[PDB]
Amino acid sequence: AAVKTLNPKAEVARAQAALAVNISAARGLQDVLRTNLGPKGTMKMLVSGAGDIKLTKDGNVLLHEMQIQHPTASLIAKVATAQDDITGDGTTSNVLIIGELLKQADLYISEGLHPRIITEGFEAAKEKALQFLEEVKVSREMDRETLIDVARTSLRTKVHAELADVLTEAVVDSILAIKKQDEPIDLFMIEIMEMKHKSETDTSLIRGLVLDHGARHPDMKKRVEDAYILTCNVSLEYEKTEVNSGFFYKSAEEREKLVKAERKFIEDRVKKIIELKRKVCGDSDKGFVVINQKGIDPFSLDALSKEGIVALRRAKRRNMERLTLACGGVALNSFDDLSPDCLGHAGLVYEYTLGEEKFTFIEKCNNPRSVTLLIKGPNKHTLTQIKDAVRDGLRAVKNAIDDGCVVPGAGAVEVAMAEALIKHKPSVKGRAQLGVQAFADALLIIPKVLAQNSGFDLQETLVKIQAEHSESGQLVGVDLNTGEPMVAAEVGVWDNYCVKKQLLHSCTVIATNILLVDEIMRAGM
Amino acid sequence: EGPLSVFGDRSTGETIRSQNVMAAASIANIVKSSLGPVGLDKMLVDDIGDVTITNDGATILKLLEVEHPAAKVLCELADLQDKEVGDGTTSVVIIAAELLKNADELVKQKIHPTSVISGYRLACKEAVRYINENLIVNTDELGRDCLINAAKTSMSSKIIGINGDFFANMVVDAVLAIKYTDIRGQPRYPVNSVNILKAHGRSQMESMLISGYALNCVVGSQGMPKRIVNAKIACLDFSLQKTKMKLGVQVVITDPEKLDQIRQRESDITKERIQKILATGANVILTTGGIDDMCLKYFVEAGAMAVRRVLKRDLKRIAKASGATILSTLANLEGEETFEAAMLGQAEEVVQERICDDELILIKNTKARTSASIILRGANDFMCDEMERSLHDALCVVKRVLESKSVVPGGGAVEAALSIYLENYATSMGSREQLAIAEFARSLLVIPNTLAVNAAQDSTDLVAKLRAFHNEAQVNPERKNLKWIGLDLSNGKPRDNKQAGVFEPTIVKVKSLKFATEAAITILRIDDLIKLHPES
Amino acid sequence: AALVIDNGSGMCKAGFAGDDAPRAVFPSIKDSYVGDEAQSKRGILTLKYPIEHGIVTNWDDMEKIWHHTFYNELRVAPEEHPVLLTEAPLNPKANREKMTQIMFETFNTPAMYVAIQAVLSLYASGRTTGIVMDSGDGVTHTVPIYEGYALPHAILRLDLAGRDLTDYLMKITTTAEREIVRDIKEKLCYVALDFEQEMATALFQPSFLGMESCGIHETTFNSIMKCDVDIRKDLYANTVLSGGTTMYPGIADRMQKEITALAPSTMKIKIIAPPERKYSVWIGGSILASLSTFQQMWISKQEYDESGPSIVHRKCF
Amino acid sequence: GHRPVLVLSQNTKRESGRKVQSGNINAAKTIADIIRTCLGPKSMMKMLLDPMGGIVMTNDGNAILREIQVQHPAAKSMIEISRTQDEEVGDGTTSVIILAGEMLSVAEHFLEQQMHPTVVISAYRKALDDMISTLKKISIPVDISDSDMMLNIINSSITTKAISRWSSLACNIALDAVKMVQFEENGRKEIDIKKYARVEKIPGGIIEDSCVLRGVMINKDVTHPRMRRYIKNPRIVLLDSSLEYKKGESQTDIEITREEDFTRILQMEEEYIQQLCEDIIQLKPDVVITEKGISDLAQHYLMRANITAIRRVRKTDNNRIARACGARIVSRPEELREDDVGTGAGLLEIKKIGDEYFTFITDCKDPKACTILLRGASKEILSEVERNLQDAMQVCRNVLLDPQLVPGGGASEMAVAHALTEKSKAMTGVEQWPYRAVAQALEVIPRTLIQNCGASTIRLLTSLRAKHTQENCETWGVNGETGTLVDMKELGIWEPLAVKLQTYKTAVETAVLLLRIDDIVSGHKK
C-alpha cells in the first residue's frame, strides 16, 4: 500500500477493513458489557497481575480492568471515562448504545450504503431524540421520596438488594445534609471512610467526621463529650531555620540553655493553645480537640496532653474544610490572634481502634454541612464495591437535584424515543431515513438487554412493550420479574435526564466519528 | 611483513600510486556532477535520517566519511578553498584529481615524479602569470553591474539560480552595506557580519534584506512592548540578576537584625544598576547574560525592551552598527559605578517581528554605520540551509570582486586559454618537464569537459570548438577579443562570456590552480605506504 | 506513557517508559534559524545544578530545570503523563512535599511516584531483593530491599564517597593537582584483598582515612542483620553495588571476603557489580513505570488534592 | 587480514541518476496519495496510533503526515513542507502536498524525455510567478467589519472538518476569539492566537455548550477554604515571586550563641512574610495570583484582609490573566502600583466541573486574551475539535491581515491554470511544455474534490475546463458534496488569498527542491 512503501513496519487497515476492525471491536465490548446492565446483571470478578480481587458490575470499572489492547476499545473506554467523570452513571449503557449504533450501521453499509448517509441519519435522529427527551422529562420537586427512588434505581443495579436499601437512605441523607438552597452541591463535603471490620449492611452515615487517625500520645483521652475543636494548619513540631543557623556554645551549661531555648518558638504556640483552652473551659467539664494539618512533635503532644487536650496531627487538606463546615470553627494557619470564635463544637469525640490503625469520630455536631459515609465491610473488595456504588448513588441524587427533571427508567424513554424516531423518519430527505431506523434499533438495546438479563425473550418482550406504548402512550419499560410492560414512573424506576442526554450526545458523536474512519494506521516507528 | 616485521601493511611503487589516484578520482567523481549552471544537488543522509541537500563541494566532502589519506587531502583542499576564497571548492577538487591522474600516467611511462612535479610547478607559475597578464577584466570599466554579474555567476548552479536576477541585488546591497574603511583608507567588506537567518514559509522571492540587524532573540517578558521607535540601545556584556557574593566572600550573621538588610541588598544592588541605565534614556537593553524576572519587571515598568542571552557576535555587530559600547561592567576610571549616555547606541526602530510562528528582533536604520541582515524564506529547513550556503558563496564572491578589482571570464574560458597557452609553452622547457607541462595544460580542460558533460551535450565537440577559438586568439593578434569566449551550456555553443556576464574573481581561479597544484604535488610524492595496525 | 525523570544527583536523565535510554540528559547534554530555540536553552545551560550530595538545595532552580526538561528537551505536556521521580535514600520529608507540590500544582501531573535511587538501581539489574551499596560523589548508602521496597528502618548511612576516598590519596593541595590524584582515582585503583600483600610488591578500615565509625562492609553486614532472619539469606547473597566511586576501585572480592567473615558460615554471599550501564537508575525507573503495579502505587492528582503533604507522606506517622 | 583499504566508509551507499530522480518523485507522490482522500468536505477520518499508546482521529493533512514516520529523504521533505504550510497559514496542509506531488509527477515525464531538470525548474518558476500574478488579479477584497462575511470565510475553512456539524457555533467561537486577541501597542498590530487564545478541553458535557470566555480559565482552587470562591468586582494582583521566605543567593550562614537568637530569627521570618503581605494589602486587592508558592502564613495574612489567593499558576496562564483583567505581573510587592493592579475583570468564580475545581476570571471588559472552553465526548473528539478551531482561527487571522479572497471548490485552480495555458501560447522556447504541464497539474485539486465526492472526474473536469474558457467564469468550481459545477459567488466557498498564495509557492518550491536533487549519499556518521 501507500504507507507500507515508506514505513515497511507499518500496520494499516483500509476502508472496509478499517470499518470491519472498528465495528468488530465495538461488538466485542458489547458482548462483555451486555451482562452488566440492570439489577439482574451478573457481577464480574477481576484479578490484577498482583492478585487483587475486584467484584464489579460497573461499566467503567469493568472496561479499565478488562485486559484489552484495541484502539477502538480505547476510544470507547475514554468516552465512558468522560461519562463517568461528569455524570457518574451511564457507562454500560453508553457502551451498549455505541456498539448497537455501529452494528445497525453495518446492517446498511454491508448493503453498499455510504457511511456518510448513515451519519446524517444519526444527526437527524439525535435532534429528534433530544427533543422527545426534553418533552418526556418529568420536572419534579426533589423530595426525599423521589430522591430515595432515584438512589434505589442506581444502588440496586450496583449492589445487592438489602445493601442497596441501606445505601439508599445513607446516600440520600448524606446529600440532603451537605446541601445548601440553590447552590451547587460540593460532593467533596462528603468524606468517604471505609472500615474493614463489620458486616456490609453496617455501612452508615455519620453526621460529622471520621478521621483515619487518632492521638499519638497515650495519656490523651480516648473519649470527649462536649468538645471544642481547633482546626489548625500550624506546625507544632521543631522547624529548623531556613538560613542554616547552627548553634555555637562554649560550655555544657550553654548547650543546655540553647537546647531549652531552641524550642521556645513552638512552646509559645503550644502555650497559646493551652491559654485558649483554659480560657474557654476553665474546668474539666468540656473537652478540647486540636486537629492539625501539620505535625506535632512528642514534646508538644506531652505539653497538650498534660492540659487535657486531644491532638491529632497530619490530617487531610480537605478535612480542614470538612471540619470547619461540620463543627463550625475557623481553620487557622497561625495562632497570632486566636479567639474562642475560631473554635467549633462537637457533641461527642472519641477513638476507635481497628487492628493496627486508629479512627477518630467527631459526632453530634449541630447542623453539619459536611458528613461522612462509613463504608463497613468484611473484605477489601466489598469495601471497593460499596465505594463504587455510593459514588454512583451520590452522583445520581446530585444530578436529580441539580437537574430538577427526572426521566422514567427501565428502557421506557428508549422505547418511546424509538417509536418517535420511527414516526419521524418520513420527514427525513433521502436515504438518511435508514440511519434513523438504525438509531431507533440502537435506542432499543436498553430494554432488549434488560430482558436478556432478566431471562426473557428479547423479541417478544420488546413487541409487547412497544404495543403497550402505542395503544396507551404511557411511558412503559421492562418489569424484570414478569417480563411485562410496567409504568416506570408509577413503580419508582427513575433515570437521570442529564445521563440520558449525555448518552445521546456522546454516543452519537463517537459512533459518527468511528463510522467515518476509513483508515487505521500505525506508522510512528 | 617478512624481513621488515613491521606490524602493519605496506604498499610500494605503482601499486600505491594507483591507489592514491583511485582515491582522488573517487573524491572527484563524488562532486563532478555538481559543477556549473547544469550541475545538480546531492542528498546526504546521516545514518539517523538527518538529511542535507547541497551543491557546495566543500560541504559534501565535509559530510562524507573518508578513510583514505589521499582522499582526506582533497577534502582538506576543498575546506581550504572554502576558507580562503569562498567559491571554487568543486573545481579545485576536480582539477587536483585530474592533475593526479595525468601525473600518474606520466609516472607509469617512467617519467620521474620529480620531473612531473617540476613541470607542474612551472606550469602553475606560468598559468598564474598568463591569467594576471591577459585574462583579467577591471570591474571599474564595468561599474556596478559587474558585481551583479559575478554574484549571478556564483549563484548559478545553486538553488537560487534563476532567481539570481534578484538575489544578486540583495547580495550586492548587503556587501555594500557592510563596507567599512580602515587605516590606509582601504575599503574592507567583512562578510560574516551580514547576518543570515532562515525561516521556512513564504517563497524565496519573499526573502528580506534588512538595512540594520536581525536577532534570533525575543523580548524577555510578555508585558514589555514589542516595538520602539527612537531606539536608544544599551549593549551589556554582564547579567542582570540578583546579586550573589563571589567565592571568597561569606555572609556570617551574629546579630539577626542585620540579616534582613543583607538580603535586601542582594536585590537592591541590581536594581540600582538598572535604574542608572534607565536614567540615561535607554529604551532597548541587550545583554549577553541573563535577566531575572525581578529585573524584567523593571524593564516592563520603564517601557523598555530587554533581551537576554544575546550572542556575543550579534552584540558586537549591533554595537558597531548602532554606535553603542559593549560594557562588561558599570565601572569608570573614578572608582564609582555609572552609565553615560555616550555609551548608548541609536536606531530608528526596534521591533519584534513575526515570521512563520516564530518571532525575531529587527533593529532598523542604525546610525554610525550601516549593517545588513538577510532572512531567507523557503519551503523547509533543507532548502533554507542550501540557500544559506549558496548565499555565503555569493557574498564571498562579491567581496573578492570588490577587494581585488579584477575578474576573469567563466564557462571554461580561462581553462581553455591556459590549455592552449601551456601546450604551446611546454615546447621550451626541457624534454620531460615539457611532457609534465603539456599534461598540466590538458588537465585544466577537465572543467569545460565536466560542464558540458553535466549539460548533457557533446563535450568533445564543444571543447574542441573552444580550443579552436582560443588558438585563433593566441596566434592572430587581430582576434584577441576571442579570449572572452567560453561555454554556453543552455545551447551548447561557445559564447562571449565577458559580454554575457559570466565573471569569476581572479583570485578564485588563481587559488584553485595554486592549491590544486600543491595537493597534486603532495600526493604525487608518495611512493610507499605503511599502514600500521591499531594500538589496541 | 510515563515520564521517568531520574535526578540521581547526576543530570536529569529524563525520558519515557519503555525507552532503554533517557532522552533528556539536560546538564551537559538549530542556530541561525528563526525563533527562540537556542536563547531559552542558553539560559539554562549556565544554571547551577540544584542537587548537591544527593539533596536539593535550590528548588526554584530544580523547578525551572524540570520545566525545561518537559517543554524543550522532550516537547511534551505533563498534564497527561504520569511522572516517576527519584530521591536519595533517607531524603527529608520536606523535600518530598516540595517536589510533590511542584509536580501536582505547577506541572499538574495526573499522577506521580517517588522512588529510591538504590531501589531503581536494583531493578535495572533485574532483581527485586538485595542490599545495594550506593557510593557516588558525596554520600555512601546501604539500602536493604525486600519485595522491591527499601526497608526504611535498616538504612545505615556512613560517609566515604569519591571525595573522602581521594582525600587520603591527596595526602599521599591545589585543585588541579588534587584532581591529578582524582584522575588516578578515576583510572585503575584495584581494590586490595589484603593491603599487606598489595604493598609488599611496592573505607573498609576507618583508621586508614582517619574516621572512627565503621567500614562499608560492617555497614552492609549490620544493615543485613537489622532485617528478617529469613530474608537474611537473600540480603547476603544478592548484594548489588552501584556508584562510580565504588566502581573506580572495582571493589567486589575484598568486601565479599570480609562480609563472609562477619556473617555466619551458612549464607553464601555473591555480589553482582559488573553492569555499569551508566543509566541503571533510569532503566529501573523505566521498568517500574512500565509495570502496572506503578499504576497501583500512583499518588494520583485527586489523592493529592484530597490529602496534600499527608498523601505525599503516605500517612502511617 | 589486510584490512579493507576503502576510500569511503563501509555502509556509505551512493545512488545516482534517473533512478534517484524516479525514486524521489515516487516517494513524494506516495506521501501525496496517503492524504489524497483527506481533501474536501466529503473526506473521511483517519485513526493514527502514536508510539505513546495514544490515538489521533483526524482529517488534517499536517496531523496525518506528522504522525507517520518515513526514512526516504524525499518523503521527509514533503512532511517538512506540510509542516511549513501548517505553521505559516494553518490551512491547505494537504492541498500543498497534493499539488507538490502532482508537479513532481508531471516533471517525471519531461525527465524521462531527456529534458534537463534545470529547464523544468525554470519553467516551474515562470509558472509560479504567473500563478501569483493571476491570483492577485482575480482576488477580491473583504470588509472585515462584516461579521457575517467573516463567518462565511471561516465556514468555508471548517466545512471540510468534523466540527462542520456545529459549524456556525465554531465559527462564532473562532471569530470572537480572534477579535479579542487583536492587540496594538506602540504602532504594532498583533494577532497572537497562540499565546493568548487558549483552548481548554474538558471531556464530558456536550459540544454545543462549549464557549469562548470573556476572560480566562485555569484548573485551580483557593489555597485556603476560608477564601471566597465568588467575587463580583475583583481587583487582581499577579506575581512572579514566591510569597514564602526563601534563602539568599549568597552563603548566608548564621551563628547563634545567645538564647533569644533562634526564636528571634524564626519570628523574623514571620515578620518578613507579614511585610510582604502588607505591601500587597496596601493596594487592597480581592484576588492574588502567583506563579510561585504561597506560604501558609502568607495565606493567613491575605485571608485576614479578605483576599483570595491561587498559588502556583503557569507563566503562560499568568500572561493571559494579565491580558484579560488588565493587570501587570510584578515580582516585588514593594514595587507594586495601582497601574499594576488588575481592573477589568467582571467576575472571579471557582466552580466544580466534574471532580475538578476551575477558576474563571470571566465577564471581563476589553480582554486582550481569551480561553475557549471546549466540552465534548472524549479527549480524542476534543483534540480534533481543537485542531479544527486552530484552522478556523488561523484563517480568520490571515484574513484580518490580508483581507483578499479567492474562490474555492477548485475554481481558483482552474482559473489560474487557464491563465497559464493562455500565456503559454506566446512562449516559443522549449519550456512551454513543462509550463503547460504545471498548468495541467493545478487541475488536481478539483480532481481530488470530485473523486472524494464520488463523481465522474472526466466529465466534470471537461465541462469545467471548458467553462473556464469563457470570459466571466473564473469563479466556477465544483461541489464536494454533490459533484456538480457551480458559481462560487452562489456557493460561498472563498479562501484567503494569502492561504492559496502560500500553498502554490510551497508546492512549486518543493517541486524545484526535489528536482534539483540527484546523487543520494548515505551511511556517514554525524
Ligand SMILES: Nc1ncnc2c1ncn2[C@@H]1O[C@H](COP(=O)(O)OP(=O)(O)O)[C@@H](O)[C@H]1O
Ligand atoms: N428495578 C428496575 N427495573 C427495570 N429496569 C431498571 C431497574 N433499575 C434500573 N433499571 C434500568 O437498568 C439500566 C441499567 O442500569 P445501570 O447498570 O445502573 O446503568 P449503567 O448501565 O449506566 O450502569 C438503566 O437504564 C435503568 O433504567
Ligand SMILES: Nc1ncnc2c1ncn2[C@@H]1O[C@H](COP(=O)(O)OP(=O)(O)O)[C@@H](O)[C@H]1O
Ligand atoms: N552561467 C554560466 N555559464 C557558463 N559557465 C558557468 C556559469 N556559471 C558558472 N560557470 C562555470 O562553472 C564552474 C563552477 O561553478 P560552480 O560549480 O557554481 O562553483 P564551484 O566550482 O565553486 O562549485 C565555474 O568555473 C564557472 O566557470
Ligand SMILES: Nc1ncnc2c1ncn2[C@@H]1O[C@H](COP(=O)(O)OP(=O)(O)O)[C@@H](O)[C@H]1O
Ligand atoms: N463545499 C465545498 N465544495 C467544494 N469544495 C470545497 C467545499 N468546501 C471546501 N472546499 C475546498 O476544499 C479545499 C480545502 O480542503 P481541506 O479538506 O480543508 O484541506 P486543506 O487543509 O488543503 O484546506 C479547498 O480547495 C476548498 O476550496
Ligand SMILES: [Mg+2]
Ligand atoms: Mg447506574
Ligand SMILES: [Mg+2]
Ligand atoms: Mg561556485
Ligand SMILES: [Mg+2]
Ligand atoms: Mg482548510
